[PDB]
């Protein structure tokens, strides 16, 4: 209650989320107060998991192993090693002034970290000498005392994975670099671990629906807070997710001067037929067209309502709700995919409703009644290999393939046999008439004991197409059994967005994410920032705020570290804001004079030093080398920031950490593209194709503010032609030769044509636009990559690139080098097409976000054309070869 | 607080590791433990100049020949060691010194010549032949033994004051 530590904790988490937690106590919503109380056992669950095998389990929480998905190395990666072995440099600190000595070892890549240490102990003991005292004392007491640590960052090898499965070692093998690892004592790391102190907060202390012989009707009494700029009306509609359960109905047009309706709207649906996730979607529309002009319908404000509350009670009686402003355009007068709930702002259009009052409290039937009605329907209703093969054909369809009404009836008839093919469940679920209690009851029973499926397929059951709780509960339980922490971080942004699709705060998906965020701090780091970046959106600030509160209440001492990051970001947000407010027109020189004069301030220079990088919490940021900080030459004044790496062996990784801070552009689309590029590269690497990509780090921390990783030794191909004085078509091959001479030249041409192939396929499939010479960059060794992924889903090859691919020849298209090049594009294009369902799922899960290029499924339908999903795989290759050989 | 960066180079089995280990921890090894690239450091008093020595034990095996370019760019001085049993030691020691002057185009680079295992009563290399090549390269020469501490200090200390000549 008034516990001194709780008053301090409540103040600390209020600084991290941007709003005081006393505002949550003011909320009178019984669902909100129930969430704060009932979510706490998830906090208790994860804290107990951290303290299970202490202190090793606490070290695993704070420093979890950044590990790859599979220990198996592909053929082309294994051949990069010297007869299966890898050379690793082991370091150790000796002087109190941080002096270092090294051992270089040639070990198998399979060796666990403890066996790598066993080689160093063997090498050290062979230099000294003792008999029956070396094996007895030295070997025994030097074992179980040390661990391996990456030189330069806070990554530890705390688990007995194969050494090559760690992502740092895997990258050194693929780049030719040599791993630099540091030995340190276990008790030196355990002494630096924080102490857990999680205690429960103070706030921790009659008629069935199917017996209602009536049709659904809803009143619209009147509205308030409307400003005129002819007539207005309210458009309503019962929705199950994004699909309407019946025809939409409007009200009689009333002049906007004084709006009163007081009319009952009848809906073509029986009350016993209302599904669990049934929602009322309504809005207020204006009609502005008379005397010579076609009348125009535009929505003023909107607002959705759950027909059942979180206690499975059908809403009845009078009700008022404030409506939300129109979204970024709309493709209709209604917004079903919108969020459900009343607007906290009370100077907004408020609409007073009245739902039918039946004399008793109406509840949704429990599963015992539902299962009994299901067996009644199937009993009243009382193998062929031909259509059995067709069921497999329907299973392989992409999630946006039009399933005809004949195929829907075909799937639903064979609903008991398609449990043999469990991946057909999403196709079967969309062939269900959710406005029929007879069908939904039988569908509840089949999903009740449905065979679990892969995480990539179960995430599809979490987008806006599947709002039923039983369907989502099955999808969550599939993730709880099969989703590793590696893949959870990979699809974390998608799984965070689909939280908005849940109609209740206390659900099963949020408990799975919160538990994993409090069990893995690498997860909880980005889990925090994805939630925090959207706290400005008042449509989700209450859900994400209450979730952040429960996280920050049990995340441990990492809250203190997050508050350093928040305060550092708010200082950068304030600096770039007034930089735009007062110095937008002034030139870059006087802008810099203002910049450095504000960064020398103590309050500022204290907050921007000594904190973890939000791009990667393993990267420590120390002193701000403001001599190297500058305002870049872009539209919205990006801040090139340079910190020093405070790690004891920063020189072995990097002494300076350069990060771009952008304030002006929306970075949500750049995140998604870079995530997909990362996934495409993982698909290509796992099946032979060595196509090196470069998905540099990018993180959105708020409304059009975020961080961008700086890639080193990279030059825009304009900066290549600009040094060399106007455009020419052979300069790219010359600079790549001037930086790669002799034997090194052939490898640079190799890396160039592979990265160029991977980005020709990536930019074509994703359909990213506005590709010009200033969007394409090249590294020193020849790695090509792209930047600025502002627009996608709205065919690249240049004579300059082909000359480099064919090693300077004139007839580059008729070259054996070029034939190997396009063969890589063909194998890479088909590789992405075989995983087309995964990429379609990721895009469709991101529809709940407010991204401009992702508002409807028709935006996602662009990749169906580039991947040619309606045609055959060969017909798709024929399509790609013609599209990518047009001229060029 | 002067720090001298020394690099011990030579062929495999000539004793370049037993030389350094003999310097620091007053010890001698009989096990041929092949080295790739190790580093040692210890404070030494030389002519009143209390200085730190950063030694870099290299690989005598030709398998890791690509690693020679980097430690030859960073080393201030080099401790070329040959085996007084192997005639091949004096042959490829030409390539070692000539490669040092290739990554550092300067023809004059600190580099004292060392020949280990002088304690052995059976030697197959003449002392004058080493002093002949030492004068040809304009460099000193120290005959050493790693098990008897025979001038192992003098072999390194000469290179420490040899680097001071360039500095
Ligand atoms: C924390 O105490 C040291 C624990 O070290 C270890 C623990 C377990 C396995 C190997 C080692 C280990 N030992 N010696 C190393 N080089 C080393 C060699 C000689 C000296 C004495 C000197 N003045 O030249 C000092 C040194 F450091 C190295 C280099 C890489 S690993 C390692
Ligand atoms: N008797 C005797 N043996 C010596 C002497 N110096 C070295 N050895 C022996 O010579 C062998 C080779 O030693 P080592 O230092 O590993 O040679 P190296 O030049 O470092 N080999 P590498 O370059 O591959 O690491 C060992 O068996 C060692 O005991 C010495 O002065 N006397
Ligand atoms: Mg790293
Ligand atoms: Mg050696």
Numbering used by the authors:
A (entry chain A): 105 to 309, 324 to 347, 352 to 504, 523 to 864, 870 to 939, 954 to 1047
B (entry chain B): 1 to 167
What does the paper say about this structure?
We recently screened a small-molecule library for anti-diabetic compounds that mimic insulin’s action and identified compounds that bind to p110α as molecular glues, enhancing its interaction with RAS39. The glue compound D927 increased the KRAS-PI3Kα interaction affinity by three orders of magnitude, facilitating the stable complex formation and enabling structure determination of the KRAS-p110α complex at 2.81 Å resolution. In the KRAS-p110α complex, the glue D927 is positioned near the interface, primarily binding to p110α and interacting with KRAS residues. Structural analysis shows that the glue compound D927 binds to the p110α-RBD at the interface within a pocket formed by the central β-sheet and rα1-helix. The p110α residues V196, Q205, Y207, K228, Y246, Y250, and L287 form the D927 binding pocket and predominantly interact via hydrophobic and van der Waals forces. These interactions stabilize the rα1-rα2 helix and intervening loop of p110α-RBD in a conformation conducive to RAS binding. At the KRAS-p110α interface, the amide group of D927 forms an H-bond with R41 (KRAS) and engages in van der Waals interactions with Y40 (KRAS). Thus, D927 substantially enhances p110α‘s affinity for RAS by forming additional interactions and stabilizing secondary structures containing key interacting residues. The conformation of R230 in the KRAS-p110α complex differs due to a longer side chain in glutamate (E31) in KRAS compared to aspartate in RRAS2 and MRAS. Structural analysis of the KRAS-p110α complex revealed that the glue compound D927 binds to an induced pocket in the p110α RBD and interacts with KRAS residues R41 and Y40, leading to the hypothesis that modifying the RAS-interacting group of D927 to create a steric clash with Y40 could disrupt the KRAS-p110α interaction.
RAS proteins cycle between inactive GDP-bound and active GTP-bound states. Mutations in RAS and PI3Kα are major drivers of human cancer. Their interaction plays a crucial role in activating PI3Kα and amplifying the PI3K-AKT-mTOR pathway. Active RAS interaction with p110α, along with phosphorylated receptor tyrosine kinases (RTK) interaction with p85, activates PI3Kα, allowing it to modify its lipid substrate, phosphatidylinositol-4,5-bisphosphate (PIP2), to phosphatidylinositol 3,4,5-trisphosphate (PIP3). Here, we present structures of KRAS, RRAS2, and MRAS bound to the catalytic subunit (p110α) of PI3Kα, elucidating the interaction interfaces and local conformational changes upon complex formation.
